[PDB]
Design a binder for this molecule. Structure first.
Ligand code: CA
Length: 348
């Protein structure tokens, strides 16, 4: 079969006027470094020795990786706001990705923060902004970007295509109903885009959704979003059910409260104690702070998602998860862990 590799990352590239003060390095410097690390991870495979009994607790390989996956095909970034930093980032990503889209609001202020990079041609693109009537006080726009990509051809001259969507949802922790309204719209727009670009014959290899959803799969506060119908149609490889994580799933928001290299963070996040200290956990309501280490449960708030549809694909092909990874390659450069997924598309 053919393998396709996706990654999502919130890279926190704000304008210097709004970013943390008293920094020796600006947003442009971090952006260049993020772009170089992504390129270097994607371009160079890590040593892969033979494994005789691979992933015995799951249907696919899963890990906390110090690198972006080699042979990455599609990259969805959020919070790419600073234009000069976005330029540095594009210059660096260009060494690996042939098709880069930024300023995506034009396909709907250019303040979505979304960037998409692809090794495969982009056939169609749509951007939709989530409604936010706020007396014109929003500094950024939250929204969803929809892509259709050309990924090959069959021996019968049928075009092989794939669908990708990336989004950044409403952030305030108490605003559960607003995120459910946004997920309702994301569901509607995914179907609208599929219909508008469906109209050579085409075979669908995959249909992926990713992004910074700003809700976890472990706290009672996010219970309504966890139960949303989107998860019925777009499968979350880290989930056993609403509010129930698989044992190997970890949080993706770092606790922002010192040289920590990708290898160091990897080792830290492979331990329960390191996760309790480095990752965000649901805040205790009586103190308004992260609960004492010994009382924390699970592996942290996972708010960055990487999902795949099982329905709607070519009936003759099995598109399944091959690998799922939480990435530490941007340690010190952003407050989220990038998430990646490889899908193996096979016949027979
Ligand atoms: Ca942020």
């Amino acid at each position: 079969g053919k393998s396709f590799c996706f990654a999502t990352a919130n890279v926190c590239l704000l304008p210097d006027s709004l970013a943390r003060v008293n920094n020796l390095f600006n947003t442009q410097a971090r952006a260049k470094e993020i772009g170089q690390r992504i390129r270097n991870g994607a371009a160079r495979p890590q040593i892969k020795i033979y494994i005789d009994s691979p992933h015995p607790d799951e249907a696919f390989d899963h890990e906390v990786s110090a690198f972006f996956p080699a042979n990455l095909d599609f990259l969805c970034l959020q919070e790419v706001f600073d234009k000069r930093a976005a330029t540095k980032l594009k210059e660096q990503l260009h060494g690996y990705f042939e098709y880069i889209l930024y300023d995506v609001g034009v396909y709907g202020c250019l303040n979505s923060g979304l960037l998409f990079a692809s090794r495969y041609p982009i056939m169609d693109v749509a951007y939709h902004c989530y409604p936010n009537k706020c007396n014109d006080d929003a500094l950024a726009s939250k929204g969803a970007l929809f892509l259709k990509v050309q990924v090959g051809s069959t021996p019968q001259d049928q075009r092989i295509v794939g669908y990708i969507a990336c989004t950044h949802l409403h952030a305030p922790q108490e605003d559960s109903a607003i995120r459910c309204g946004q997920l309702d719209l994301l569901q509607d727009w995914l179907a609208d885009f599929r219909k508008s670009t469906s109209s050579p014959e085409e075979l669908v290899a995959f249909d992926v959704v990713c992004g910074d959803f700003n809700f976890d799969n472990c706290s009672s506060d996010d219970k309504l979003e966890q139960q949303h119908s989107l998860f019925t149609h777009y499968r979350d490889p880290c989930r056993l059910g609403p509010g129930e994580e698989k044992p190997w799933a970890i949080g993706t928001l770092l606790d922002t409260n010192d040289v920590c290299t990708p290898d160091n963070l990897q080792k830290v996040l492979e331990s329960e104690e390191g996760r309790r200290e480095y990752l965000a956990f649901p805040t205790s309501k009586s103190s308004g702070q992260k609960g004492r280490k010994e009382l924390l449960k699970g592996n942290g708030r996972r708010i960055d998602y990487m999902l795949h549809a099982e329905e709607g694909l070519c009936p003759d092909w099995k598109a399944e998860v091959e690998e799922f990874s939480f990435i530490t390659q941007l340690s010190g450069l952003t407050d989220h862990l990038p998430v990646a997924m490889r899908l193996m598309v096979s016949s027979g």
